[PDB]
Amino acid sequence: EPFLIGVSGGTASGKSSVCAKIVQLLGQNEVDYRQKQVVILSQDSFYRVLTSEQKAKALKGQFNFDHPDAFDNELILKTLKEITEGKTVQIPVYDFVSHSRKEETVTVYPADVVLFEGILAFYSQEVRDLFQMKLFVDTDADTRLSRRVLRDISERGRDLEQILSQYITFVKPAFEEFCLPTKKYADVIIPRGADNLVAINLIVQHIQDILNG
Amino acid sequence: EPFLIGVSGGTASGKSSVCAKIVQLLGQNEVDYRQKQVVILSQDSFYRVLTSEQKAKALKGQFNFDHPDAFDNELILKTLKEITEGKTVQIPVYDFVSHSRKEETVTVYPADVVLFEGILAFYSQEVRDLFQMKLFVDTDADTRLSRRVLRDISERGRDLEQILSQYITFVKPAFEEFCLPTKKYADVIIPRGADNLVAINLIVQHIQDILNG
Amino acid sequence: EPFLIGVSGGTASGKSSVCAKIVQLLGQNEVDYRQKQVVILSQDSFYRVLTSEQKAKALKGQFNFDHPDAFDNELILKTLKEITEGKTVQIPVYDFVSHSRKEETVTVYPADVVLFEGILAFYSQEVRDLFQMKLFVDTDADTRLSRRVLRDISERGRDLEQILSQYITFVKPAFEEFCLPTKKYADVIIPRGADNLVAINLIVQHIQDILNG
Amino acid sequence: EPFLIGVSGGTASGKSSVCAKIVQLLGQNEVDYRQKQVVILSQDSFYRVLTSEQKAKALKGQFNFDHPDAFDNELILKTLKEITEGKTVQIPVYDFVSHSRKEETVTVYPADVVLFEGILAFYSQEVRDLFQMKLFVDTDADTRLSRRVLRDISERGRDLEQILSQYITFVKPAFEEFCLPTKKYADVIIPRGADNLVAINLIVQHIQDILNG
Ligand SMILES: Nc1ncnc2c1ncn2[C@@H]1O[C@H](COP(=O)(O)OP(=O)(O)O)[C@@H](O)[C@H]1O
Ligand SMILES: Nc1ncnc2c1ncn2[C@@H]1O[C@H](COP(=O)(O)OP(=O)(O)O)[C@@H](O)[C@H]1O
Ligand SMILES: Nc1ncnc2c1ncn2[C@@H]1O[C@H](COP(=O)(O)OP(=O)(O)O)[C@@H](O)[C@H]1O
Ligand SMILES: Nc1ncnc2c1ncn2[C@@H]1O[C@H](COP(=O)(O)OP(=O)(O)O)[C@@H](O)[C@H]1O
Ligand SMILES: Nc1ccn([C@@H]2O[C@H](COP(=O)(O)O)[C@@H](O)[C@H]2O)c(=O)n1
Ligand SMILES: Nc1ccn([C@@H]2O[C@H](COP(=O)(O)O)[C@@H](O)[C@H]2O)c(=O)n1
Ligand SMILES: Nc1ccn([C@@H]2O[C@H](COP(=O)(O)O)[C@@H](O)[C@H]2O)c(=O)n1
Ligand SMILES: Nc1ccn([C@@H]2O[C@H](COP(=O)(O)O)[C@@H](O)[C@H]2O)c(=O)n1
Ligand SMILES: [Mg+2]
Ligand SMILES: [Mg+2]
Ligand SMILES: [Mg+2]
Ligand SMILES: [Mg+2]
């Protein structure tokens, strides 16, 4: 029943902002949580719980959060399957500042349209096949690195050199090995991320049509 | 005023078939010529009339039909502006077999939506500014060459050797120098071409909305 | 022990002609077979013997000769190791017209320098580690397709349609999945191919040094 | 008489370090300044003197040091021509910390081999034709940005946000518009910059051969 839209692109490409803008333009930020018609799920909500050793390494920017193994892919698939079945689900909340899953959770009631966004949203064939539309937010790597540096220092309490070390060591290689090869599965490529008002209004209009019947 | 959609991409990327699929799905092929609400204009209709020396080289695959100068940009601008003003216009008919413009012209009546497609549709800023939406059909160069070889032999009366010679000598360099750099002006990138049904349906749905108001 | 130089690059990038130009410039074509100091080995000599079903599909351009499995990597490793040990070896002769290995084999006597070239020469780590120098011939995909079409029609008994079909279906995908990713192992990237005289002369000069001691 | 080698690549690709390593391995750092056989000239030595307004903007990372206009190209050409004529020349010394030409200068006596390195070494046809060998140090843009950030903060007294602003606004666009299109003129592409010992020893050996006669 629900129409699932998968959204991918590299880190800091604008995935989160594109999805947030779409939902805001659809007037969903005003709808009762129990009656939202369009919701956004982030693949990062499903990052795995780290062991003491792993967290230690994460604090030093030495843990690989960009490899498919960093995510609980079974939980992702099972949650998406339940959503397609019209079931109400609970989604974990991840804290990038402490590299941990919070205690609080977000309950997702049956929706008509679901946006699932993540750096590896198209990595798994099973997950891919669940999407009726696949969008890829394409932003150059150097541009994304500049955005990631500014974002991580000002929002995630990260140190510049740690960010750059983590990026060169893990983010870049994993993006090239696991994310780029999935771009070919996208139906539509969106450049300029959240500043692309034309592409965004196009998706908004399409979703509204789907909502109207 | 009519809603203009510009469509670009390299040679044989799928521009013509994408526009053709869009109007077919909109049911325009079952509407009388005078009653069509969506019409397709091709930049190739505006190739310049060749001088005798130019045609000579053209017959040997030694003329550059991929340079911006090969198109009558002044006529393109004039024609598109008149269309924007709701005027009925006559446009030339180009024959790829003879590298020449035919005697007959095509009457383009006022339509609600106009698709203008061509390898250098986004080259001119004045032209570019007339499009309310810009689409770029992105298809790999080798895939496109394959498509062009078969198409040119079967539709444009060309022979293998000349096609490859012209491609390597003029088409490839011109694409990199003049076409590729215009990709940044597109609002939406459609990979592969006419087989991309989700992207096509997104544009069809958008156009149907314009037609309904 | 002999100095081994590995050479890779996509199909028709210019690997064979680059190696051929190098030995020609070193004057090896004017030296008796037994006296040659620089020899060329092609990975294509190690294609596997096809089963009846495989040859059937091969005749229709429906067999994947671009997958690592299409080569006998065990024989390649064994042969190269023996050559490294200064042993004389016999290598197979492959016929592209019939997709089969000939009855006769070629005797490879101990040489001071060995050029081993092939589309997947850097795929195997064990093989890769035997090369003291690795060169990757980088030529654009469309340029390469053009070259392959002409070469395959004139040298490998293929017809246009089948070539393009095989290329798009197996060659292109395999290059992106298996060949392209090995480019990172090259020490030197030689663009364009055999027409790159400065790059070729650099390798010739380097080899002449090895020959002089 | 002198053999000129042009070296290009984007900012922080490793151009300076590659050239320095080559000269050091050739034993030139021990030779009397008046008798050096191999010398390195940097295109940055020829940055233009800024006006008061320009310097003000430079202090804010708002001046375009990546456009061909930022360099005194006539002085570059004339100096290279004089060097080819065996003339002794004087080369300005640039200070990145103060965005200015210093008073001190470096005198360059007749050399046998000259390495000229810069982000736009291959931009001018006249300058390009002076080179008998053209090398391009190829390093990914995101990797180069990370290196540039670390370098500018620790060696050029620049602020992080100013570096990123200057990079996004000027460096990246100019690299893509003016530098990338010159890569096609390179004879040899060198990856991994100064860590590529194989490629570096190859150039060293070639130069030594040129020096020996
Ligand atoms: N179009 C843009 N221009 C400049 N900065 C942007 C743009 N889009 C996003 N950013 C910034 O880049 C960072 C990446 O944000 P986000 O939308 O969450 O990307 P992603 O979800 O792919 O990681 C954010 O800090 C955001 O404010
Ligand atoms: N998905 C596809 N698979 C096989 N052939 C295709 C596909 N898409 C287009 N073609 C063919 O490729 C050629 C390029 O066609 P066209 O749509 O006219 O591109 P363009 O208008 O950009 O030049 C045509 O002969 C067309 O029928
Ligand atoms: N610079 C060039 N210009 C035109 N044709 C070329 C050039 N270089 C190679 N070719 C041709 O392209 C084809 C590819 O040849 P080859 O050297 O065998 O490449 P590879 O060994 O990588 O498959 C050959 O038919 C060859 O003669
Ligand atoms: N191979 C490398 N690995 C890590 N850092 C490097 C490497 N090569 C250079 N760097 C660093 O990157 C910066 C770029 O240096 P440089 O050689 O001067 O490049 P360019 O001359 O192209 O600007 C320097 O601060 C240097 O120490
Ligand atoms: N604890 C974590 C979890 C993820 N991440 C990063 O978050 C990125 C994915 O989130 P964005 O799509 O929002 O960029 C990954 O590239 C990864 O390196 C992190 O830096 N620390
Ligand atoms: N007489 C002509 C006119 C155009 N052309 C080619 O047609 C192409 C543009 O049309 P397509 O977008 O349909 O490929 C150009 O790349 C150009 O080389 C040609 O081959 N002969
Ligand atoms: N029987 C065979 C064996 C190999 N090949 C092709 O030969 C190529 C490898 O040789 P080149 O490097 O000379 O191009 C592969 O891309 C493969 O498709 C073929 O077309 N038929
Ligand atoms: N005053 C100056 C002059 C040049 N530059 C930078 O120096 C770079 C070129 O030097 P590198 O090749 O050493 O990176 C340019 O990208 C330019 O932005 C600067 O940041 N301030
Ligand atoms: Mg995000
Ligand atoms: Mg067309
Ligand atoms: Mg070959
Ligand atoms: Mg430098």
Short mmCIF file of all heavy atoms in Angstrom, two decimals, chain C residues 4 10 14-15 23 56 61 81 89 96 145 167 179 188 193 199:
data_model
loop_
_atom_site.label_atom_id
_atom_site.label_comp_id
_atom_site.label_asym_id
_atom_site.label_seq_id
_atom_site.Cartn_x
_atom_site.Cartn_y
_atom_site.Cartn_z
N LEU C 4 59.94 -8.11 -14.86
CA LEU C 4 58.59 -8.20 -15.40
C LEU C 4 57.82 -6.89 -15.33
O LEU C 4 57.77 -6.23 -14.29
CB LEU C 4 57.79 -9.28 -14.66
CG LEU C 4 57.87 -10.70 -15.19
CD1 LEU C 4 59.31 -11.18 -15.18
CD2 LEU C 4 56.97 -11.60 -14.34
N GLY C 10 41.65 -1.07 -20.55
CA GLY C 10 40.47 -1.69 -21.12
C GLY C 10 40.67 -2.28 -22.50
O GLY C 10 41.74 -2.13 -23.10
N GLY C 14 45.03 0.06 -26.26
CA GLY C 14 46.33 0.17 -26.92
C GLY C 14 47.42 -0.66 -26.27
O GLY C 14 48.60 -0.47 -26.56
N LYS C 15 47.05 -1.61 -25.41
CA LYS C 15 48.05 -2.43 -24.72
C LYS C 15 48.98 -3.17 -25.68
O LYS C 15 50.20 -3.07 -25.56
CB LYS C 15 47.38 -3.46 -23.81
CG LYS C 15 46.42 -2.87 -22.78
CD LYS C 15 45.74 -3.96 -21.95
CE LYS C 15 44.87 -4.93 -22.80
NZ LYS C 15 43.67 -4.31 -23.47
N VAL C 23 59.09 -2.94 -28.12
CA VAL C 23 60.12 -3.88 -28.58
C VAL C 23 60.70 -3.50 -29.94
O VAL C 23 61.87 -3.75 -30.21
CB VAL C 23 59.62 -5.35 -28.60
CG1 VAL C 23 59.15 -5.74 -27.20
CG2 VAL C 23 58.51 -5.55 -29.60
N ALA C 56 28.94 -22.42 -27.91
CA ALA C 56 27.68 -22.14 -28.57
C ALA C 56 27.29 -20.68 -28.32
O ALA C 56 27.05 -19.91 -29.26
CB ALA C 56 26.60 -23.07 -28.04
N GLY C 61 27.80 -14.28 -29.38
CA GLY C 61 28.22 -13.12 -28.62
C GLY C 61 27.55 -13.11 -27.26
O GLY C 61 27.35 -12.05 -26.66
N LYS C 81 55.59 -17.68 -12.83
CA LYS C 81 56.55 -18.07 -11.80
C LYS C 81 57.73 -18.80 -12.44
O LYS C 81 58.88 -18.54 -12.12
CB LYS C 81 55.89 -18.96 -10.74
CG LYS C 81 54.93 -18.20 -9.84
CD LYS C 81 54.45 -19.06 -8.67
CE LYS C 81 53.53 -18.25 -7.76
NZ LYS C 81 53.02 -19.04 -6.60
N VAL C 89 59.45 -21.97 -21.19
CA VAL C 89 58.08 -22.43 -21.07
C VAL C 89 57.35 -22.44 -22.41
O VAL C 89 57.76 -21.77 -23.36
CB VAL C 89 57.28 -21.52 -20.08
CG1 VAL C 89 57.98 -21.48 -18.72
CG2 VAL C 89 57.19 -20.10 -20.64
N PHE C 96 41.00 -15.95 -31.91
CA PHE C 96 39.78 -15.19 -31.65
C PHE C 96 38.67 -15.50 -32.65
O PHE C 96 37.49 -15.35 -32.33
CB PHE C 96 40.06 -13.69 -31.65
CG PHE C 96 40.92 -13.23 -30.51
CD1 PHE C 96 42.26 -12.92 -30.71
CD2 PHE C 96 40.39 -13.10 -29.23
CE1 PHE C 96 43.07 -12.50 -29.65
CE2 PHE C 96 41.19 -12.69 -28.16
CZ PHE C 96 42.53 -12.39 -28.38
N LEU C 145 35.80 1.73 -27.95
CA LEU C 145 34.76 0.97 -28.65
C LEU C 145 34.95 1.15 -30.15
O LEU C 145 34.82 0.20 -30.91
CB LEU C 145 33.37 1.46 -28.22
CG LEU C 145 32.20 0.84 -28.99
CD1 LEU C 145 32.25 -0.68 -28.89
CD2 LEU C 145 30.89 1.37 -28.44
N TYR C 167 29.60 -6.10 -26.50
CA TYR C 167 30.24 -5.00 -25.80
C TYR C 167 29.34 -4.44 -24.70
O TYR C 167 29.72 -4.39 -23.53
CB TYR C 167 30.59 -3.87 -26.77
CG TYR C 167 31.30 -2.73 -26.09
CD1 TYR C 167 32.66 -2.82 -25.79
CD2 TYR C 167 30.60 -1.60 -25.65
CE1 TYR C 167 33.31 -1.82 -25.08
CE2 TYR C 167 31.24 -0.60 -24.93
CZ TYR C 167 32.59 -0.71 -24.64
OH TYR C 167 33.23 0.29 -23.94
N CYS C 179 38.03 -4.51 -14.32
CA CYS C 179 39.24 -3.85 -14.85
C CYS C 179 39.53 -2.47 -14.25
O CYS C 179 40.59 -2.25 -13.66
CB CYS C 179 39.12 -3.72 -16.37
SG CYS C 179 40.56 -2.96 -17.20
N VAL C 188 52.44 3.85 -13.37
CA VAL C 188 52.40 4.89 -14.39
C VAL C 188 51.18 4.71 -15.27
O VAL C 188 50.86 3.59 -15.67
CB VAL C 188 53.65 4.80 -15.32
CG1 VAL C 188 53.59 5.88 -16.38
CG2 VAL C 188 54.92 4.93 -14.49
N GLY C 193 47.60 5.55 -25.76
CA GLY C 193 48.13 4.35 -26.38
C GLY C 193 49.45 4.50 -27.11
O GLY C 193 50.32 5.25 -26.69
N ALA C 199 55.76 8.85 -23.73
CA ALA C 199 55.57 7.84 -22.69
C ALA C 199 56.29 6.57 -23.13
O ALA C 199 57.02 5.96 -22.37
CB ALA C 199 54.08 7.57 -22.45
#
